[PDB]
Amino acid sequence: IIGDGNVVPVLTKRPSASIIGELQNKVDSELEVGAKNFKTIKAEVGLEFSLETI
Amino acid sequence: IIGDGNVVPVLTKRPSASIIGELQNKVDSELEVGAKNFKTIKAEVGLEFSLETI
Amino acid sequence: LPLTAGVDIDPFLWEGYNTVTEAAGNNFSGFAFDPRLTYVLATARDSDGRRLNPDINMGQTVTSYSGQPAINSRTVGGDVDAGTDTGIRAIGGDWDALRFGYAHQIGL
Amino acid sequence: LPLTAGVDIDPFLWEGYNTVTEAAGNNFSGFAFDPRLTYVLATARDSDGRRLNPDINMGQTVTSYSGQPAINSRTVGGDVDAGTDTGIRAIGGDWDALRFGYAHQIGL
Amino acid sequence: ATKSVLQPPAAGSASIVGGAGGTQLLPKNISQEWWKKATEQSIIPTLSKSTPV
Numbered sequence: 001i002i003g004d005g006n007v008v009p010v011l012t013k014r015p016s017a018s019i020i021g022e023l024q025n026k027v028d029s030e031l032e033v034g035a036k037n038f039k040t041i042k043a044e045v046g047l048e049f050s051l052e053t054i
Numbered sequence: 055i056i057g058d059g060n061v062v063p064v065l066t067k068r069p070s071a072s073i074i075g076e077l078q079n080k081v082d083s084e085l086e087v088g089a090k091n092f093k094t095i096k097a098e099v100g101l102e103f104s105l106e107t108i
Numbered sequence: 109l110p111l112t113a114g115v116d117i118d119p120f121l122w123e124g125y126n127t128v129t130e131a132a133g134n135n136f137s138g139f140a141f142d143p144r145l146t147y148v149l150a151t152a153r154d155s156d157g158r159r160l161n162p163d164i165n166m167g168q169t170v171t172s173y174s175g176q177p178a179i180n181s182r183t184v185g186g187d188v189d190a191g192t193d194t195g196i197r198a199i200g201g202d203w204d205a206l207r208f209g210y211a212h213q214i215g216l
Numbered sequence: 217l218p219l220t221a222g223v224d225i226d227p228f229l230w231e232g233y234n235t236v237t238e239a240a241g242n243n244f245s246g247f248a249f250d251p252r253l254t255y256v257l258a259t260a261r262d263s264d265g266r267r268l269n270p271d272i273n274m275g276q277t278v279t280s281y282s283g284q285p286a287i288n289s290r291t292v293g294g295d296v297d298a299g300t301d302t303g304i305r306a307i308g309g310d311w312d313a314l315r316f317g318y319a320h321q322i323g324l
Numbered sequence: 325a326t327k328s329v330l331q332p333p334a335a336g337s338a339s340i341v342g343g344a345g346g347t348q349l350l351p352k353n354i355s356q357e358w359w360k361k362a363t364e365q366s367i368i369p370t371l372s373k374s375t376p377v
Contacts, residue, residue, distance in 0.1 A: 016189035017099040023326055023334040028102045056211045057330060059352040065360040070297040090359070094211045116265060119222060125274050126255045133361030136275050155264045175273030207355075248367055289365045296364045316372035 004039040058093035109197060114153045116160055117145075121173060124200050137203040138177035142184040145197045146170050176200075217256070217305060224260040224268055225253075229281065232308050243310040246285040250292040251277050253305040284308075 013032035020026060067086035074080060109120050128134050150164035164170065169180040178198075187193035217225055236242050258272035272278065277288045295301035328337040331347065341349050 014189075015099050015101055017097045020096050020098055021334060022328050022330040023337050026098050026100060028100050031101055055351055055353045057350060059350055061352060061354045062207065063354065063358045065358060068297075068363070089354075092207075118267075119259065119261075122255070122259050122274070123221075126259075129255070129275075130252060154266070173274070176275060246371070248371060287367045287371060289367045291364050291367060311371045312373045314368075314372040315375040316368060317375045317377035319377045 002040050004037055006038045006040075007035050008037075010034045010036060056094050058091055060092045060094070062090050062092075064088040064090060109148070114151055115148075116152045116154075117148055118152070118160070121198070121200075124198075125174075128201055134202045135204070136176065136200060138179070138200070139173060140184045140199040141170060141173075141178045141180045142182055142197045143169050143180045144182075144185065146180070148197070222259050222261045222265075223256075225256055226260065226268070226282075229306070229308070232306075233282075233284075236309050242313065244284065244308065245311045246287070246308070247281055248292050248307040249278065249281075249286045249288050250290055250305045251288050252290075252293060254278050254288075256305065257281075 010033065012034045013030045015029035015031055017029070018027055064087065066088040067084035069083040069085055071083070072081055109117055125136055128136050146164065146169045149161045149170055150159075150166075150168075152160040154160055171178055171180070182188055184199060185193050185196055217228055233244055236244050254272065254277045257269055257278060258267070258274075258276075260268040262268060279286055279288070290296055292307060293301050293304055326337045327340040328334045329340050329350070331339070331350075333339040333342065339346070341347050
């Protein structure tokens with residue numbers, strides 16, 4: 001799309017497991033996202049002729 | 055199986071022959087088992103999210 | 109393993125095979141490779157500058173060495189999850205000396 | 217046999233063959249090898265470091281050498297049962313110079 | 325007071341086999357496949373020339 005609003009999601013952290021005993025407390029891991037965004041630019045070319053040159 | 059009751063039998067000593075004269079006493083030799091036991095462990099992973107995140 | 113650029117590690121991979129098989133009835137069975145070992149093999153070049161393992165393409169990993177199977181994972185070097193890199197780049201052995209199993213497995 | 221890493225023992229295996237066949241005038245009919253000799257063979261390399269016998273894979277033992285048959289056992293090195301390692305890694309000769317037989321056998 | 329089963333019992337729990345001699349009840353899995361290396365081959369009777377003795 002035109003403008004700086006093009007966005008790609010980036011996985012930034014991931015879950016990793018623990019080792020635990022029989023009645024030891026379970027624990028949470030981590031999971032995180034960032035994003036990169038990008039803009040557009042415009043390229044143009046044109047040519048002009050007199051009618052006689054057409 | 056869960057626990058420390060997983061067991062592998064290990065041959066630990068073996069018969070070795072001997073060389074004996076005409077009326078020399080015959081002799082017995084070794085033969086033996088040991089074992090290695092091993093235990094299970096538990097790997098766990100979990101993630102936790104707010105209602106607004108869900 | 110030496111860390112010099114373009115060095116031949118074939119002497120050292122064999123030194124480990126001897127280190128295992130010199131003892132008793134150890135039947136050497138294969139390797140675990142860190143994928144970073146494939147660059148060390150692929151760029152090993154002789155005294156005259158020509159490649160010692162020319163058959164290794166970019167983006168391959170070595171799945172066999174000296175006729176023995178190899179399997180690749182960066183879990184071998186151990187810089188996975190919160191782990192630090194151990195500097196390990198291969199493990200060789202008799203993989204029947206390792207017995208493994210799942211007792212129980214709990215889904216999501 | 218020299219201890220040095222990567223040394224070629226082919227000069228020495230030929231020196232022993234020459235000792236049996238010329239210095240003693242005997243035939244020569246094969247080798248007994250310790251399995252540990254196959255590493256010393258397989259890792260032998262040139263003055264510029266290439267392998268001298270690259271057809272030996274890891275986990276092989278050689279059953280022939282220089283057209284002579286070979287047979288493999290650590291009974292050659294002798295660290296079997298309560299024996300210590302003699303450091304012997306091969307015996308070569310005319311095996312017809314060794315005559316052997318059983319006078320009597322008692323089964324189990 | 326939760327019923328543990330691994331040994332020794334996890335802290336503040338009690339073992340489900342915590343009665344006298346109860347651990348003799350815990351399951352055991354002996355592998356039918358041994359850790360048993362092969363022994364060295366005898367080479368002399370095949371290398372040597374046979375003779376009556």
